[PDB]
C-alpha cells in the first residue's frame, strides 16, 4: 500500500511492515545457495555471480571460524557487515574463554543485531539473508532473515529460482541423514543444478562448495576435487 | 576495597577417583578477632562447579553473585546439557575479571579456586536443572571419573591463573601443599582423600592463627555437588613435652 511503505516503523492496516518485507524481497534476487547435512557433515554449495565475460565470479561462501561458515543472499555490504560481526564474536569468545562459541548463541546475537535495526526510523533492515553452517557437537544449519527471525533446518536453499532446489531437497531429504560425505556433496551439487538454468552449466568457476564436519574444519573444496565431483554429477545425470 | 577487613583462611581442593574434594574451615576473622565461626566459604555455581575463596568476604560475595547470575543466564539459554558452562569456562571468566581489575588497580582481595567436572558424559544431572530444591538430600554408586575430565583452577589477586591436580590457597600453600606434593596420588578413594585433607587441616589448625577445626567438605561427583555435614576435626598435640609442667623444669636459666 502506497501510504504505509514509506517508513519502517509503520504497520499497515493488516499489521505488516512493508519496509522489512522489501528488505526480504532483496534476498530473492540473489544467486542460489543450498546447504544439506548428514549425521556428521554440512555441505554448502552456491552459485557465484559472474557480471560479464571478463569479470571474475564473486565470492559466495565465507569462513567465520574453524567450524563455522556462511553463505549470503542479498546486499553484499550488509553481508560483509554481518560477517565481520560474526567473525569478531567468535574470535572474542575464543579470547575470553579459550573455547569455541556456542553456535546457537552466535545466531541469536546475529538475529538480535538484525532486529535492533527494525525498531528505529533512522535505520533500515538488512537486505541480506544468511545461511550458517556449523559443527558444534553436531552439524547445524541456520537461516537468519531480515526481520530478526532465525530458524534451524535439516536442508535449506535460498536465492533466485531456488524453488527447484527446494523441490529436490524435499524429495531426497530422507536420504541425507545416512549419506556418506561423497553422497552428500553430490546431492548438494544436484540440488544446485536443479536450481540452475538449463542453458547455464555448473563449472569450477561459477560453483562454490564447502564442507564442515566432525573432524573436518570448514574448508572450501579444491578446484581439482570440485572438477571430479562435477564430472561425477554430469556422468550420473547422463544415466 | 582498599584492603582486607573480614577475611577467610586457606582452601584445599584435590582430585580423587570420583571427582573433586574441596575443604575449608567455616571461620571469618575481623583481624585477630574470630567474629564469625559458621561462615560458608565454598559456593555452588552449577551442578558441576564450585568456587572457594580465601581473603575478603565482601569481594568473595561480590564474585559469588556475579557467578550466580552468569549461571542463571546460562540456564535460561540452555537447550541441551552440553550448553552448560564448564569449570574451565568459569575459571577463564574469573581470571579475566581479576586481570581487568588489576589493570584498573581496583583488585578483589581474594584468591579463588574454581573446581568441578569438565565433562557431561558421566550423568544426566543437567538434563533437568533444579535451583531451589536439592533432590540429593535414592543412592546409586558413584562414577569413576577420569582425571583428565576433572578441573581445578587457581586465580590470584594479580590475575595469575593455572590448574593442577590439587590447588591450595592461603596458608595451605605451605603445609597442605608440602603434604600433597609428597603424598598425593591418582585415583584416591573418598576415605583416603578425606584422610589426606584432614591431615592438612590439622596441621593448618596447629600452625595457623586464623584457622579453625570446624570444617566444611564439598564433593563434586557424578551425583552432583554435595555439602557434607560440618564436623569438628579432632586435633591433639603430638608431644608430651608440651604438657610437661613448667615447675618440673630447672628453676634457673631460660627454660620457658
C-alpha cell at B82: 552440553
Edge-to-edge strand order for the sheet containing A42-47? Answer: A155-158, A33-37, A42-47, A207-212, A219-220
DSSP class of residue A101 equals P
Experimental method: cryo-EM
Residues of B in contact with A142 (CB under 8 A): none
Whose grid coordinates read 613435652? B241
Q: Hey, what domains does chain A have and what are their CATH numbers?
A: 1-234 (3.60.20.10)
Other beta carbons within 10 angstroms of residue A99's beta carbon come to 13
Q: Is B169 noted as a catalytic residue in this protein?
A: no
The whole-angstrom distance between B89's CA and the closest CA on chain A is 6
Whose grid coordinates read 598425593? B184
DSSP class of residue B167 equals E
Binding-site residues on chain A for chain B (CB distance < 8 A): 96-99, 102, 104-105, 108, 137
Instruction: Mention every residue, 6+ apart, whose C-beta is less than 8 A from residue B164.
Output: B152, B154
The candidate with the shortest Cα–Cα distance to B71, out of B151, B131, B135, is B131
Residue from the list B77, B88, B92 with its beta carbon closest to the beta carbon of A105: B77
The whole-angstrom distance between B92's CA and the closest CA on chain A is 5
* C-beta separation of B187 from B17 below 8 A: yes
Residues of A in contact with B89 (CB under 8 A): 97, 99
Whose grid coordinates read 536443479? A194
The residue of A97, A98, A103, A104 whose CB has the most chain B CBs within 10 angstroms, and thus the best one to mutate to test that interface, is: A97
Which residues does chain B break after (C to N > 2.5 Å)? 137
Catalytic residue among B1, B68, B86, B133: B1
The Cα B214–Cα B41 span in angstroms is 12
Test A96 with B96 for CB contact under 8 angstroms. Answer: yes
The three-state secondary structure class of B199 is helix
Instruction: Mention every residue, 6+ apart, whose C-beta is less than 8 A from residue B142.
Output: B18, B19, B190, B221, B222, B223
The three-state secondary structure class of B189 is coil
Instruction: Mention every residue, 6+ apart, whose C-beta is less than 8 A from residue A184.
Output: A36, A37, A38, A41, A43, A176
The Cα A121–Cα A187 span in angstroms is 44
Q: How many CA atoms lie within 13 A of B49 on its CB side?
A: 24
Alpha carbon distances (Å) from A6 to A3, A145, B43: 7, 21, 56
The Cα A71–Cα A42 span in angstroms is 12
Residues paired with residue B33 on neighbouring β-strands, in sequence order:
B30
The whole-angstrom distance between A153's CA and the closest CA on chain B is 16
The three-state secondary structure class of A8 is coil
Model resolution, angstroms: 2.6
Q: Hey, what domains does chain B have and what are their CATH numbers?
A: 5-232 (3.60.20.10)
Write out the DSSP string of B90-119.
HHHHHHHHHHHHHHHT----EEEEEEEE--
Three-class SS of B131-146: CCCCCCCCCCCCCCCC
The Cα B84–Cα A53 span in angstroms is 52
Amino acid at each position: 500500500r502506497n501510504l504505509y511503505d514509506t517508513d519502517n516503523i509503520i504497520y499497515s492496516p493488516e499489521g505488516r511492515l512493508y519496509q522489512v518485507e522489501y528488505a526480504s524481497e532483496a534476498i530473492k534476487q540473489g544467486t542460489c545457495a543450498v546447504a544439506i547435512k548428514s549425521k556428521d557433515y554440512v555441505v554448502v554449495s552456491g552459485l557465484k555471480k559472474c557480471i560479464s565475460k571478463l569479470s571474475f565470479p564473486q565470492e559466495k561462501i565465507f569462513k567465520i571460524d574453524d567450524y563455522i561458515g556462511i553463505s549470503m543472499s542479498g546486499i553484499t555490504s550488509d553481508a560483509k557487515v554481518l560477517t565481520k560481526f560474526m567473525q569478531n564474536e567468535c574470535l572474542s569468545h575464543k579470547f575470553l574463554y579459550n573455547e569455541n562459541i556456542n553456535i546457537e548463541s552466535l545466531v541469536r546475537s546475529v538475529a538480535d543485531k538484525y532486529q535492533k535495526n527494525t525498531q528505529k526510523s533512522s535505520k533500515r533492515a538488512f537486505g541480506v539473508g544468511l545461511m550458517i553452517a556449523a559443527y558444534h557437537n553436531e552439524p547445524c544449519i541456520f537461516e537468519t532473515r531480515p526481520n530478526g527471525s532465525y530458524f534451524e533446518y535439516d536442508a535449506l536453499s535460498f536465492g533466485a529460482r531456488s524453488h527447484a532446489s527446494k523441490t529436490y531437497l524435499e524429495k531426497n531429504l530422507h536420504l541425507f541423514e545416512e549419506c556418506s560425505l561423497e553422497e552428500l556433496i553430490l546431492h548438494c551439487l544436484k540440488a544446485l543444478k536443479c536450481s540452475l538454468s538449463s542453458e547455464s552449466e555448473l563449472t569450477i568457476s561459477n560453483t562454490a562448495l564447502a564442507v564442515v564436519g566432525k573432524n573436518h574444519p570448514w574448508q572450501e573444496i579444491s578446484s581439482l576435487q570440485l572438477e571430479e565431483y562435477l564430472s561425477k554429477v554430469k556422468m550420473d545425470a547422463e544415466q | 576495597t582498599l584492603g582486607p577487613v573480614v577475611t577467610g583462611t586457606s582452601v584445599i581442593a584435590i582430585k580423587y577417583k570420583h571427582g573433586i574434594m574441596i575443604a575449608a574451615d567455616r571461620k571469618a576473622s575481623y583481624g585477630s578477632y574470630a567474629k564469625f565461626q559458621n561462615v560458608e566459604r565454598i559456593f555452588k555455581i552449577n551442578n558441576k562447579t564450585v568456587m572457594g575463596f580465601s581473603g575478603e568476604l565482601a569481594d568473595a560475595q561480590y564474585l559469588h553473585e556475579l557467578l550466580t547470575r552468569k549461571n542463571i543466564n546460562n540456564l535460561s539459554e540452555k537447550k541441551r546439557k552440553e550448553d552448560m558452562y564448564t569449570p574451565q569456562h568459569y575459571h577463564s571468566y574469573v581470571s579475566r575479571v581479576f586481570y581487568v581489575r588489576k589493570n584498573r588497580i581496583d583488585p578483589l582481595f581474594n584468591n579463588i579456586i574454581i573446581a568441578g567436572i569438565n565433562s557431561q558424559k558421566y550423568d544426566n544431572n543437567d538434563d533437568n536443572v533444579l535451583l531451589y530444591t536439592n533432590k540429593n538430600n535414592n543412592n546409586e554408586e558413584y562414577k569413576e571419573i577420569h582425571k583428565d575430565d576433572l578441573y581445578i583452577g587457581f586465580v590470584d589477586m594479580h590475575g595469575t591463573n593455572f590448574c593442577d591436580d590439587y590447588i591450595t590457597t592461603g596458608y595451605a600453600r605451605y603445609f597442605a601443599l608440602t603434604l600433597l606434593r609428597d603424598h598425593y596420588k591418582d585415583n584416591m578413594t573418598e576415605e583416603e582423600a578425606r584422610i589426606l585433607i584432614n591431615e592438612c587441616l590439622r596441621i593448618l589448625y596447629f600452625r595457623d592463627a586464623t584457622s579453625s577445626n570446624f570444617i566444611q567438605i564439598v564433593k563434586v561427583t557424578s551425583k552432583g555437588v554435595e555439602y557434607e555435614e560440618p564436623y569438628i576435626l579432632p586435633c591433639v598435640l603430638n608431644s608430651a613435652d608440651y604438657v610437661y609442667p613448667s615447675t618440673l623444669l630447672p628453676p634457673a636459666g631460660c627454660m620457658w
